[PDB]
Amino acid sequence: RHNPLDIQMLSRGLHEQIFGQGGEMPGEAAVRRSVEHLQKHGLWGQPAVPLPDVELRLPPLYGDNLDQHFRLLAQKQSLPYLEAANLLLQAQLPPKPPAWAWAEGWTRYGPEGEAVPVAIPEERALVFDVEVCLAEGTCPTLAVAISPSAWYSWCSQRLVEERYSWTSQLSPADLIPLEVPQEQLVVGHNVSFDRAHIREQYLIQGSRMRFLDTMSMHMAISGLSSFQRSLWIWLDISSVNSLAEVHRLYVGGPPLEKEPRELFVKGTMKDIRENFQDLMQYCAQDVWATHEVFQQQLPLFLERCPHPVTLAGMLEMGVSYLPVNQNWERYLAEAQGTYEELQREMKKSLMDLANDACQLLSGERYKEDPWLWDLEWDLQEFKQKLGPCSEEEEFQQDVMARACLQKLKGTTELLPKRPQHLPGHPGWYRKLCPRLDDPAWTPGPSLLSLQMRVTPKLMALTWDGFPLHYSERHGWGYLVNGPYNDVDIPGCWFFKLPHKDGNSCNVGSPFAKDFLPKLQAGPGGASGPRALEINKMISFWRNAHKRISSQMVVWLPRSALPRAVIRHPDYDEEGLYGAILPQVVTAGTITRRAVEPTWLTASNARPDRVGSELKAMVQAPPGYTLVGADVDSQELWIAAVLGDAHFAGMHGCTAFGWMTLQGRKSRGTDLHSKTATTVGISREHAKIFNYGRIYGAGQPFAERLLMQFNHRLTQQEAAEKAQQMYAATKGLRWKGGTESEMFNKLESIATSDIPRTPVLGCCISRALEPSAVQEEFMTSRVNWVVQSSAVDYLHLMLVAMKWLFEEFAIDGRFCISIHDEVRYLVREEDRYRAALALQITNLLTRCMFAYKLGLNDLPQSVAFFSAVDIDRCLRKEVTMDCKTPSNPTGMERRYGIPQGEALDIYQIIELTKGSLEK
Amino acid sequence: EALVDLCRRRHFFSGTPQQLSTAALLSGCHARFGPLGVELRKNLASQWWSSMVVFREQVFAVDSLHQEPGDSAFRLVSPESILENLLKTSGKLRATLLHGALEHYVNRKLPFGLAQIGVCFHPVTRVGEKTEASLVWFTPTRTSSQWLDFWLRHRLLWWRKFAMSPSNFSSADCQDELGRKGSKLYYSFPWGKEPIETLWNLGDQELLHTYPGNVSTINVVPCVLSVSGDVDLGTLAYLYDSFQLQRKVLKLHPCLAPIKVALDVGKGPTVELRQVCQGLLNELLENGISVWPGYSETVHSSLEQLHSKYDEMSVLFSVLVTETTLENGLIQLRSRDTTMKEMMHISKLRDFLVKYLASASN
Amino acid sequence: ALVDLCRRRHFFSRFGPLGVELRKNLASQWWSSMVVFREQVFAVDSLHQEPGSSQPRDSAFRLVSPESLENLLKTSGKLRATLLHGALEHYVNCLDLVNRKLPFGLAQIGVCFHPVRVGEKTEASLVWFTPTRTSSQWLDFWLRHRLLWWRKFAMSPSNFSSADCQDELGRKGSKLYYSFPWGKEPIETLWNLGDQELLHTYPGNVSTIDGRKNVVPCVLSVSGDVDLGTLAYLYDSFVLKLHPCLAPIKVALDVGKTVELRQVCQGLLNELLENGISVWPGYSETVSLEQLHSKYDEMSVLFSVLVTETTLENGLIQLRSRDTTMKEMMHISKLRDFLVKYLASAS
DNA sequence: GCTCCTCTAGACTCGACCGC
DNA sequence: GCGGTCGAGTCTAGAGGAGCT
Ligand SMILES: Nc1ccn([C@H]2C[C@H](O)[C@@H](COP(=O)(O)OP(=O)(O)OP(=O)(O)O)O2)c(=O)n1
Ligand SMILES: [Ca+2]
Ligand SMILES: [Ca+2]
Ligand SMILES: [Ca+2]
């Protein structure tokens, strides 16, 4: 219940059934060195209050130690799928048939090429490639697949029949049926595209079919970092993610023909219905290349990723599942409507700014306006070439007046043939205002927009209190990247706006994505600042509304919803339920970190961002709870235990381990708050800097980041700050820093002949080994060690959670893993059993991470989840109400989502009596 | 200068300065709206009526008396008969138009609406009167929440359509005595937010105490949404919103401004120019453009003061007919928004004004 | 009879929806012809309740707050019986608007409460502030102008009549009449009240109570009953051939000879409504052509538009006129302009 | 640390057409 | 015959990727 460093280790009730009885005790010299290191930084001698002890009857761990237990778990998980991978690796394939069948469902052609009526491939291993016409819709057109000793093809009813009555509503009956009504492996290149077009994968209950991706395995084996990808377009051992280049790298020989007749990205239904027999040939050759490179990759992957936990986690990391309801269409509709409404409001504010800007013409006041002085204000002249009255007198006067008016309306003989266009308005205005003769004319500056070189002058935008100025030579700057002398504004220094590509480029829009964090409207008028607020509110949806609106939702009918939904009283017959299967590549980086642009992001709901509640729109169906638990400082703890194992055999022997364990955010004693206090920056930027430093980002990166976050910091001051901020943690080589042993272990395990993840032993990419790439990309290797250890953590969590769900019969399913978060779609009754399962999984995973490092112990601090958020919609905290400019009334008021409960280990034990049985 | 001083000077507001207090304005116990104020309120009522009954299907018109048969409502006591008999058979002034709408319930589809604009009497005891525009929307019970949400955003869009600053027209949520749900629009007046419009998802109760007899008269017995906006308070909201809170100008929407054209005459000869201007005025009125005759005004003033006066009165366009108009037909048209002077030919003036006022409304 | 036809076609309830629309049209015509076309006539808004006099002789109902009998006739407000007193309180209010240049006018269409119970009538009042010397001249001018206004919209201007009478104080005044089938009922009345009426509402300084000289105007009151006037126009127009500037519904769309026709009618209706033409959307009805003709005739619909399959083939819509009961073909794009031209020419 | 692809929109330049 | 006006042409900066469609 304590260690030689007074850190409360695990309770004897759990420790005696997790770690070894005899184990090993640290020596006197090791403990003395650890105590000296802790006392050097002042962290030794600061005891903390003890957490209440936990007494659980853990499930009987298999094997002898934790390592054998996991290995057996992962082997039993990925046994039937590695068999299918091996079956596909060694096979004999008949040649691609010359012709293909114009059927409505699946087709199979063998040696005889018979027109075989197929609905299900009925095979455990099928390479795949789905072809979808982008213009017509996201529904598949056709697909060609191969299983050993077979060739497969399926074409949608949208081609065999030529009617155009196709709705935008998506149902699973429009997709590819693969699964049988047991274990199966379906392979492809970018399978996340194929899986999203499969029918049986849009079901709330889990699926026993797992998907393996050639792109992911390639990225694991011989992947390229983004800089290496740029340099590629080690060169003979790696390639870019495209199928042709990968096939050239691994298999080689006759290159794959990229079709220039792009009848799937810029084509129609007829273009495909005509060149069917050639588009299928191209798809078949793509499938053949994928199969050949899979043959060349699978042995390499199993050699370089030996631990079964890696493959098991990859097989379970790529079955993500995000349920939705009819509120998704309300989210999209309301977000787009608010985007259009705020765009109209911003345009009207811009037109009002323009109208209030003309009045500078009166008296030539524009010559002193700091923003509109350099525009064109020129004017043009026209051209050309007592008592009442009697009824009779009134009629005569009316007739005389009308006659005089009609006589005056006949002098059009002098006006010119082509009417002038607003000669009375100033020069820069006539461009804005449409042509008076246009059939689509609207009044005022109806052509004004944000992108014009006028808008950041009508808004009177000020960068740090400095008006924005445009120069043809340099671009958008400001007046008071250096004082360029090309611009000769009297008494002003033209400093360019900083650009993401350095000071050698030009800026053409001070409303670009790079400038959102910084830049405010200047003098009086509540329409400029309002326009800027509209811009900031819309920015997210503007830059990411194509992706979100195009997400391939599939609404299930009542014919496929679980019984645990229809019987639940919260279910209504007038609501459409479905799911979104994120198109995420399991290993989208050299790290093997999954990559997806929309779902897997750190952005969360905000009160100042239209459509930012998208994750909150993942609302579990009635009867299900999105039981999840963000891992409490995952990668920091991972690096901490790495450093602890390198330094000694016990937790907290390094200052970083103590700060991770014993430091708390309440007192500001944790890493992030300590860094913020030492430097003087906010916690949000300190988090980014710290996590970047853990990734091996060098001091110049820190200097540039400190300049970027705080532009008041010069180059020399930022360099000094970053040097002081790294010397205290990294050290001098290192020795003397809180993360000296951590970084030393990272470098030692990155500089080995075959770098391995210290937990699961997976190998780094062939393009980053010290033999192929020599001593290049040290930052990339150091980042890979920690981030791939985090991926191994996720793999261990997924394996353990699947084991717990299968053993104790929990009606759950993996939902998504957005960065370190892990969400499960557990049924409502099991929300406490699943919470206990998540606590046990965290305990076992931390113990495995410490055991594979030789620590052979675990503190009580990190032994359990701080809070297992039992909820019904994804959100950082269960108290959030998701108020956004598109959701002003909140989540509970509008969408009727009651708040959930963030439990704790003690409460979980009190609810479940400590047992996961039913 | 405060807005209320301007709206009192330019005859948007009438009454003694003791009646220009905030509570007096927001109570309705005195005739607050001057001529231009009444015209702007008529424009607001016209926009409401078109957008709710003309541009909207399934919404009709209702006529209701100013006296409810048989509460804090004032009583009507005949002085010919002049305490127990004054509170059992005496008539009572209406406090809301909701009970008038429920009288015209059928007189057979669903949903539908019964919209009305009229005067309602408020205890202040003194008597205050406010012009309430009520939409009583009937729905099946299940759809009531959805229809309430739709009406809330449609009314918010309508109120923000003419608004220079649409963000001020806020919204909220409220519950009544019986726990019924309902929203409440607002406008952020300089002193504080006031409920220019309220919506209450009245349940099945309302049709019970207006048709207490057979239930077949009231096939789902519909609920009531009771959308009710205060067009006096709305008019004051649009008078506060148009002002910037420079040049003093009420940037009222071209569909709400009371005066759209302001004719004038440059110089001599007086008779011919005035005859031409009268002919032009007769031409404008026939199409339906509200003109302000400034040529017949015997009080002569400089062009600057005339233009400032037209700005404050929210005059969209200012026309000047000078002696040169007799030669070729060029009239120095001016626009409130830009304050820039054209030289448009006579034959184009009416068509240009009609086109402008058709583009503004659409 | 006429009462049955008005009752069935929503003209009689008193005023059904079509009756209320016709009354709104009548009030709008009055407003235009007496305020917009007429110079120096303005709008007046005044509350329905009066400050309350001490004279028990008044028959106006009193306002008593239930939260609170011989004091009910002292400080309790009373409902207005005529708009005349409301106008006289705006004399100073609109005096600065005209820059104190006599003559000037005040007009208002409001509700008047008269003891029948309490009865409400919609009275459109014109109060003219004319000097004393020109009192009878302006009185006769307004008499003939109001008679022309009331005859203008009538198919039979002979039924409308005028006559004279004398006030209680010997003041002379003129009364307009309509010859209803049961006899004459005065739909309008003009009195030459004089400076006496303005004296009561302004007992204070005379200067705040005509060339260069200033005199207390010989206030004469022109008050018309637009409810009884609407009744007169419903009787006179009897198929009801109401005036085009008065009829509630101008166009009655429909379909004949499906969804494409629905969209065509929707676009036509939207264009007509945007222009400003009130339309009866007969294509939205649940379900003969002759029955529709009769219904649109009884409702006084100027033109019945029929959209058929030919409107897709040729773009020609059948147009039928209430006045002539004959069929005409016209292109869809020119229907709006034709209707606007017809309405302008009718006025 | 450093590039590549296409698609879109705003601005200076250019000659070709036209009414005085 | 010639100064004004108008419809491409060219250029450049930004923005989705560096994969599947
Ligand atoms: N500069 C950064 C910051 C974060 N991350 C990603 C990788 C990590 O897996 C995850 C960590 O985020 P946390 O939610 O763990 O952050 P904290 O928990 O430390 O934040 P706080 O303790 O303030 O809640 O974010 C990253 O890649 N780079
Ligand atoms: Ca693929
Ligand atoms: Ca392909
Ligand atoms: Ca975390």
Beta bridge partners of C118: C115
Mutation probe of ligand 1 site: the residue of A600, A635, A675 with most atoms within 8 A of C-beta: A635
Question: Residue A674 corresponds to which tokens in the numbers above?
Answer: 């300590």
Nearest to A841 by CA among A622, A623, A628: A628
Specify whether C308 is located in the same domain as C342.
Answer: yes
Specify whether C182 is located in the same domain as C279.
Answer: no
Structural domain tally of chain C? 2
- The continuous run of DSSP H or E covering A895 comes out as helix A891-895
Q: How many CA atoms lie within 13 A of A26 on its CB side?
A: 24
Specify whether C101 is located in the same domain as C135.
Answer: yes
Contact yes or no for A378/A426 (Cβ under 8 A): yes
Distance between CA atoms of A4 and A51, rounded to whole angstroms? 18
**C241 in any annotated domain:** no
Specify whether B163 is located in the same domain as B284.
Answer: no
Specify whether C8 is located in the same domain as C106.
Answer: yes
Nearest to B325 by CA among B247, B266, B282, B240: B266
Distance between CA atoms of A189 and A214, rounded to whole angstroms? 5
Question: Residue B293 corresponds to which tokens in the numbers above?
Answer: 């005759």
Nearest to A759 by CA among A589, A630, A637: A637
The contacts of residue A912 (CB under 8 Å, 6+ apart) are A832, A833, A835, A836
DSSP letter (8 states) at residue A209: E
Using DSSP's 3-state secondary structure scheme, residue B140 falls into coil
Chain B residues with CB-CB distance to A under 8 A? Answer: 149, 157, 164-167, 171, 173, 244, 247, 251, 272, 275-276, 278-280, 282-283, 325-330, 337-343, 345-347, 355-356, 359-360
Beta bridge partners of A619: A873
> Is A635 near ligand 1, meaning CB less than 6 Å away?
yes
Distance between CA atoms of A822 and A790, rounded to whole angstroms? 13
Q: Residue C115 sits in which domain range?
A: 2-46+83-236
In terms of C-beta density within 10 A (0-12 exposed, 13-18 middle, 19 or more buried), how is residue A177 classed? middle
Q: Which of B207, B242, B277 is the last residue of a domain?
A: B242
Specify whether B237 is located in the same domain as B285.
Answer: no
Residue nearest to atom 1 of ligand 1 (CA): A688
Distance between CA atoms of B235 and B237, rounded to whole angstroms? 5
**CA geometry: angle at A267 spanning A264 and A273, to 5°?**
85
**C78 in any annotated domain:** no
Nearest to A487 by CA among B56, A496, C138: A496
Distance between CA atoms of A265 and C56, rounded to whole angstroms? 90
Instruction: Judge whether A28 is annotated as a binding position.
Output: no
CATH at B224 = 3.30.930.10
- The continuous run of DSSP H or E covering A328 comes out as helix A327-358
- Is beta strand C183-192 parallel, antiparallel or unpaired with respect to C104-115? unpaired
Q: Which atom of ligand 1 is nearest to the CA of A630?
A: 14
Question: Residue A642 corresponds to which tokens in the numbers above?
Answer: 């790495």
- The continuous run of DSSP H or E covering A406 comes out as helix A391-408
CA distances from A795 to A310, A800, A820, C323 (A): 6, 9, 12, 86
Question: Residue B48 corresponds to which tokens in the numbers above?
Answer: 């409401």
- The continuous run of DSSP H or E covering A559 comes out as none
**B52 in any annotated domain:** yes
- The continuous run of DSSP H or E covering A24 comes out as none
In chain B, which residues are last before a break of more than 2.5 Å from C to the next N? Answer: 70, 82, 107, 124, 218, 245
Active site residue A129: yes
Distance between CA atoms of A841 and C51, rounded to whole angstroms? 82
Maximum Cα–Cα distance for chain A, whole Å? 126
**C74 in any annotated domain:** no
CA distances from C105 to B91, B297, C138, C226 (A): 35, 15, 12, 19
Q: Which of B209, B242, B275 is the last residue of a domain?
A: B242
Question: Residue A906 corresponds to which tokens in the numbers above?
Answer: 């003690």
- The continuous run of DSSP H or E covering B67 comes out as strand B67-68
Distance between CA atoms of A822 and A918, rounded to whole angstroms? 24
Contact yes or no for B292/B315 (Cβ under 8 A): yes
- Is beta strand B193-198 parallel, antiparallel or unpaired with respect to B181-188? antiparallel
Helix A528-543 to helix A327-358 angle (10° resolution) is: 140
Question: Residue C141 corresponds to which tokens in the numbers above?
Answer: 């001018």
Question: Residue A472 corresponds to which tokens in the numbers above?
Answer: 């043809």
Contact yes or no for A127/A287 (Cβ under 8 A): yes
Distance between CA atoms of A570 and A42, rounded to whole angstroms? 56
What ligand is nearest to the CA atom of residue A638?
1
**B253 in any annotated domain:** no
Contact yes or no for A648/A3 (Cβ under 8 A): no
Distance between CA atoms of A889 and C311, rounded to whole angstroms? 47
The contacts of residue A849 (CB under 8 Å, 6+ apart) are A638, A641, A759, A793, A796
Distance between CA atoms of B118 and C111, rounded to whole angstroms? 11
User: Which sign does the torsion angle of CA A21, A27, A28, A34 carry?
Assistant: negative
Residue A186, Cβ neighbours under 10 Å: how many? Answer: 26
Question: Residue A663 corresponds to which tokens in the numbers above?
Answer: 């430091």
Residue nearest to atom 26 of ligand 1 (CA): A691
- Is beta strand A142-147 parallel, antiparallel or unpaired with respect to A184-188? unpaired
Specify whether C227 is located in the same domain as C161.
Answer: yes
Beta bridge partners of B105: none
Say yes or no for a CB contact (<8 Å) between A387 and C134.
Answer: yes
- The continuous run of DSSP H or E covering B175 comes out as strand B173-175
Distance between CA atoms of C113 and C120, rounded to whole angstroms? 5
- The continuous run of DSSP H or E covering B133 comes out as strand B127-138
Q: Does residue B91 sit at the C interface (CB-CB below 8 Å)?
A: yes
Q: What are phi and psi of B350, to 5 degrees?
A: -65, -40
Contact yes or no for A527/A353 (Cβ under 8 A): yes
Which chain A residue has the Cα nearest residue C140? A388
Contact yes or no for A248/A618 (Cβ under 8 A): no
Distance between CA atoms of A532 and A275, rounded to whole angstroms? 50
C35: amino acid identity, one letter: V
Distance between CA atoms of B116 and A634, rounded to whole angstroms? 63
CA distances from A646 to A31, A275, A695, A745, B11 (A): 14, 62, 18, 6, 85
CATH at C294 = 3.40.50.800
The residue assigned the tokens 């030529």 is A162
Residue A391, Cβ neighbours under 10 Å: how many? Answer: 12
Distance between CA atoms of C200 and A208, rounded to whole angstroms? 96
CA C246, C248, C253, C259: dihedral to nearest 10 degrees?
150
CA distances from B245 to A484, A771, B120, B248 (A): 41, 72, 30, 10
**C243 in any annotated domain:** no
What ligand is nearest to the CA atom of residue A211?
2
Distance between CA atoms of B188 and B319, rounded to whole angstroms? 36
User: Which sign does the torsion angle of CA A470, A474, A477, A480 carry?
Assistant: negative
Using DSSP's 3-state secondary structure scheme, residue A499 falls into coil
Say yes or no for a CB contact (<8 Å) between A526 and B330.
Answer: no
Q: How far is CA A97 from the centre of its chain?
A: 41
Distance between CA atoms of C34 and C38, rounded to whole angstroms? 5
Specify whether C253 is located in the same domain as C163.
Answer: no
DSSP letter (8 states) at residue A892: H
| Cis preceding-peptide flag for C103 (omega within 30 of 0) | yes
Distance between CA atoms of C221 and C146, rounded to whole angstroms? 12
CA distances from B153 to B171, B225, C242 (A): 9, 14, 40
Nearest to A267 by CA among A135, A140, A356: A135
In terms of C-beta density within 10 A (0-12 exposed, 13-18 middle, 19 or more buried), how is residue A581 classed? buried
Structural domains for chain A: 1-90+578-654+755-764+788-918 (no CATH), 93-304 (3.30.420.390), 336-377+424-543 (no CATH)
Contact yes or no for A272/A135 (Cβ under 8 A): no
User: Which sign does the torsion angle of CA A553, A554, A556, A562 carry?
Assistant: negative
Specify whether B271 is located in the same domain as B348.
Answer: yes
The contacts of residue C218 (CB under 8 Å, 6+ apart) are C130, C131, C132, C135, C192, C193, C194, C195
- The continuous run of DSSP H or E covering A220 comes out as helix A214-222
Question: Residue A752 corresponds to which tokens in the numbers above?
Answer: 């080995």
3-state helix, strand, coil in chain A (%, to 5): 40, 10, 50
Distance between CA atoms of A644 and A656, rounded to whole angstroms? 9
Long-range pairs for B18-26: beta carbons < 8 A, 24 or more residues apart: B22/B191, B25/B236, B26/B194, B26/B233, B26/B236
Distance between CA atoms of B208 and B99, rounded to whole angstroms? 12
Question: Residue A367 corresponds to which tokens in the numbers above?
Answer: 């010559």
What is the 3-state secondary structure of chain C?
A: CHHHHHHHCCCECCECHHHHHHHHHHHHHHHHHHHHCCCCEEECCCCCEECCCCCCCCCCCEEECCCCCCCCCCCCCEECCCCHHHHHCCHHHHHCCCCCCCCEEEEEEEEEEEECCEEEEEEEEEEEECCCCCHHHHHHHHHHHHHHHHHHCCCCCCCEEEEEEECCCCCEEEEEEEEECCEEEEEEEEEECCHHHHHHHCCCCHHHCCCCCCCCCCCEEEEEEHHHHHHHHHHHCCCCCCCCCCCCEEEEECECCCHHHHHHHHHHHHHHHHHCCCEEEHHHCCCCHHHHHHHHHHCCEEEEEEECCHHHHCCEEEEEECCCCCEEEEEHHHHHHHHHHHHHHHC
Say yes or no for a CB contact (<8 Å) between C48 and B129.
Answer: yes
CA distances from A24 to A650, B299, C99, C110, C325 (A): 10, 107, 107, 100, 111
Question: Residue B316 corresponds to which tokens in the numbers above?
Answer: 């969209």
Nearest to A536 by CA among A599, A610, A438, A615: A610
The contacts of residue B118 (CB under 8 Å, 6+ apart) are B64, B66, B97, B100, B131, B132
Distance between CA atoms of A72 and A66, rounded to whole angstroms? 10
Distance between CA atoms of A453 and A425, rounded to whole angstroms? 19
CA distances from A12 to A19, A60, A497, A567, A874 (A): 10, 16, 61, 45, 36
Distance between CA atoms of C268 and C266, rounded to whole angstroms? 6
**CA geometry: angle at C110 spanning C108 and C113, to 5°?**
135
| Cis preceding-peptide flag for B254 (omega within 30 of 0) | no
Contact yes or no for B86/B77 (Cβ under 8 A): yes
**CA geometry: angle at C242 spanning C239 and C246, to 5°?**
150
Strand ranges in A510-608 using DSSP code E only, listed in sequence order: 520-521, 554-556, 577-580
User: Which sign does the torsion angle of CA A760, A766, A768, A773 carry?
Assistant: positive
Following DSSP, what letter does each residue of A638-704 receive, concatenated? HHHHHHHHHH-SSTTSSHHHHHHHH--TTTT-SHHHHHHHHHT--HHHHHHHHHHHHTT--HHHHHH
Min Cα separation A532/chain B (Å): 14
Beta bridge partners of B296: none
CA distances from B350 to A442, A672, B287, B291 (A): 17, 70, 9, 12
A739: amino acid identity, one letter: E
Question: Residue A191 corresponds to which tokens in the numbers above?
Answer: 């399978």
User: What spatial distance separates the first Cα and last Cα of chain C, rounded to whole Å?
Assistant: 30
Specify whether B331 is located in the same domain as B205.
Answer: no
Specify whether C110 is located in the same domain as C133.
Answer: yes
B314: amino acid identity, one letter: S
Count, residues in chain C: 347
Residue nearest to atom 5 of ligand 1 (CA): A691
Helix A634-647 to helix A655-662 angle (10° resolution) is: 140
Which chain A positions have a beta carbon within 8 Å of B337's beta carbon?
355, 444
**B248 in any annotated domain:** no
Q: Does residue A398 sit at the B interface (CB-CB below 8 Å)?
A: yes
**C87 in any annotated domain:** yes
Distance between CA atoms of A858 and A58, rounded to whole angstroms? 15
Contact yes or no for A527/A347 (Cβ under 8 A): no
Specify whether C222 is located in the same domain as C284.
Answer: no
Q: In what order do the strands lie in the sheet with A577-580?
A: A322-324, A577-580, A554-556
C299: amino acid identity, one letter: M
Contact yes or no for A584/A190 (Cβ under 8 A): no
Distance between CA atoms of C23 and C63, rounded to whole angstroms? 29
The residue assigned the tokens 């055991």 is A851
User: What spatial distance separates the first Cα and last Cα of chain B, rounded to whole Å?
Assistant: 34
Distance between CA atoms of A504 and A280, rounded to whole angstroms? 47
Contact yes or no for C264/C311 (Cβ under 8 A): yes
**CA geometry: angle at A688 spanning A743 and A676, to 5°?**
90
DSSP letter (8 states) at residue B202: B
